[PDB]
Amino acid sequence: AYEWGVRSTRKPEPPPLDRVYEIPGLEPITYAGKMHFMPGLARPVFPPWDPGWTHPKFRRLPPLHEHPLYKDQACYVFHQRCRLLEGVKQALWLTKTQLIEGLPEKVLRLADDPRNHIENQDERVLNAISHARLWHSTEDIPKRETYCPVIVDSLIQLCKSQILKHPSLARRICAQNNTLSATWNRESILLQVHGSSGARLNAKDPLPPVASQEEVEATKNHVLETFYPISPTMGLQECNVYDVNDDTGFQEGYPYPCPHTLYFLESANLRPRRFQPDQLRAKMILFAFGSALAQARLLYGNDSKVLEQPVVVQSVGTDGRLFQFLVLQLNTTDLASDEGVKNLAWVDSDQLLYQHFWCLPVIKKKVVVEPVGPIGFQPETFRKFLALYLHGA
């Protein structure tokens, strides 16, 4: 084959030993007595350095198998920055779900009612877009990592103002950079969702189930799509050190034990840095399932069985100009077999909030053609965004 090393770049081999060491029963004469190099004397051979007392920073890194949690079985870990090739298909396969186009009827009918709209909804959202992209920064062209979390927080505040009309939104509270872990066995291989999230919203009361029993029964006959050349594991991180313990982000007795919404933000200036929309939806599927699986096992037990009371977890993905919406319902814990009841997940893809924005007035032939402000606006994207926030109430 063609090994990728290069002789010059690789570390050179140690120089050949002097001929004196090859003569049996002959003590070589070295310069180690004078502790400095001298020509004409044999090069000493020293034993490997053995510091009597270990020092934390300056010691060599311990071997991986020395860690107590090291295990022979190879477990696969999915953190934030893992990319899946068949994002919709791989996430569906690893989770044993069924993709249903469109938001559920409860969510969609919760936004079409005019009695659930903020005052001047069209005007305030228009200012929120302008504030996020042009007003929030002193620079003329704010970078994406500045206006990606601003636009999401601005829209959260708009739907947070509805607490006066619905005095039940006070049961929600936000959490930041929590440690989440959920391990399950999926067809003789071990998977684990470990890492953190951008923003998390929790509510005191659990979210009611959203899928009718007719659809659950129809899910049994559904067959998961498969891809032969690509193994389902591709895109994950193979870790030999892990702990089989589903650990959520909070300890026992937390007054908000029911997660409600997950907010994933792809904030990065460079195009290759950010997730593709197909891969971004995969990121939401697993993390929404990871939070759902943690509750399904904490509230019922480690035993694998079908859940009589489903757990519903929502999540919203944002690019700064394009939005992704996901509502996931968990029904099955015994994921080893593929013949039981599958889960459900409603996904709306590429909900474009606005087409383009002009930070500076474009001038063609000494006249103004398009003034400052967003070009094109679709209020339904925010209307669905408002629907998810008010789903609990």
Partner 1 sequence: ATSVSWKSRTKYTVMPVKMRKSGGRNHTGQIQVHGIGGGHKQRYRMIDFLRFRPEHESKPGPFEEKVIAVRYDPCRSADIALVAGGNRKRWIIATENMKAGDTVLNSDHIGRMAVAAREGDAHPLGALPVGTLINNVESEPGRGAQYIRAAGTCGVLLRKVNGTAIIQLPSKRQMQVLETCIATVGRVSNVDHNKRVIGKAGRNRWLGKRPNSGLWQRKGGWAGRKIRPLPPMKSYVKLP
Q: Which residues of the shown chain bind RNA in the complex (CB under 7 A)?
A: 2-8, 56-57, 59, 61-62, 64, 67, 69, 77, 79-83, 141, 179, 194-196, 234-239, 241, 268-273, 276, 279, 321, 355-363, 365-366, 375
Residue listed under structure tokens 């003789």: 188
Q: Does 12 bind partner 1 (CB under 8 A)?
A: no
- Any residues with CB less than 8 A from the CB of 73 and at least 6 apart, and which? 190
Q: Which does 109 bind (CB under 5 to 8 A by kind): RNA, partner 1, none?
A: none
Residue 233 binds partner 1, judged by CB under 8 A: yes
1 near partner 1, judged by CB under 8 A: yes
Is residue 9 a contact point for partner 1 (CB under 8 A)? yes
- Residue 253 touches which of partner 1, RNA, none (CB < 5 to 8 A by kind)? none
2 binds partner 1 (CB under 8 A): yes
- Spell out the residues 6+ positions from residue 4 whose beta carbon is closer than 8 angstroms to its own: none
Does residue number 228 form part of the binding site for partner 1 (CB under 8 A)?
yes
Choose the one of RNA, partner 1, none that binds residue 363, judging by a C-beta under 5 to 8 angstroms depending on kind.
RNA
Q: Which residues make beta-bridge pairs with 378?
A: none
Is 246 within 8 Å of 297 (Cβ atoms)? yes
Taking the complex as a whole, how short is the minimal distance between the CB of residue 234 and partner 1, in angstroms? 5
Partners of residue 345 on adjacent β-strands: 99, 328
- Smallest separation, CB 215 to RNA (Å): 32
Which residue of 45, 64, 85, 368 would you call a contact of partner 1, by CB under 8 A? 85
Report the residue count for the chain: 393
Using the CB atoms, write b or e for 105-132: b if 16+ within 10 Å: eebeebbeeeebebeeeeebbbebbbeb
233 binds, among RNA, partner 1, none (CB under 5 to 8 A by kind): partner 1
Total residues interacting with partner 1, rule: CB under 8 A: 15
Contact call for residue 74 and partner 1 (CB under 8 A):
no
Which range in 6-14, 64-72, 126-134, 187-195 contacts partner 1 by CB under 8 A? Answer: 6-14
102 binds, among partner 1, RNA, none (CB under 5 to 8 A by kind): none
Helix (H) or strand (E) holding 245: none
Distance CA 102, CA 227 (A): 25
Binding at 306: pick from partner 1, RNA, none (beta carbon under 5-8 Å per type): none
Helix axes 121-130, 144-160, angle to 10 degrees: 160
Q: What are the distances in angstroms from CA 68 to CA 90, 143, 191, 240, 298?
A: 32, 44, 20, 11, 26
Segment contacting partner 1 by CB under 8 A, of 3-11, 19-27, 157-165, 258-266: 3-11
Q: How far apart are the first and last CA of the chain?
A: 64
Asked whether the beta carbons of 323 and 100 are under 8 A apart, the reply is no
CB of 295 to partner 1, least distance (A): 31
Tokens for 64, please give them: 């991986």
Q: Does 64 bind partner 1 (CB under 8 A)?
A: no
Per CB under 8 A, residues contacting partner 1 are 1-2, 4-6, 8-9, 85, 227-231, 233-234
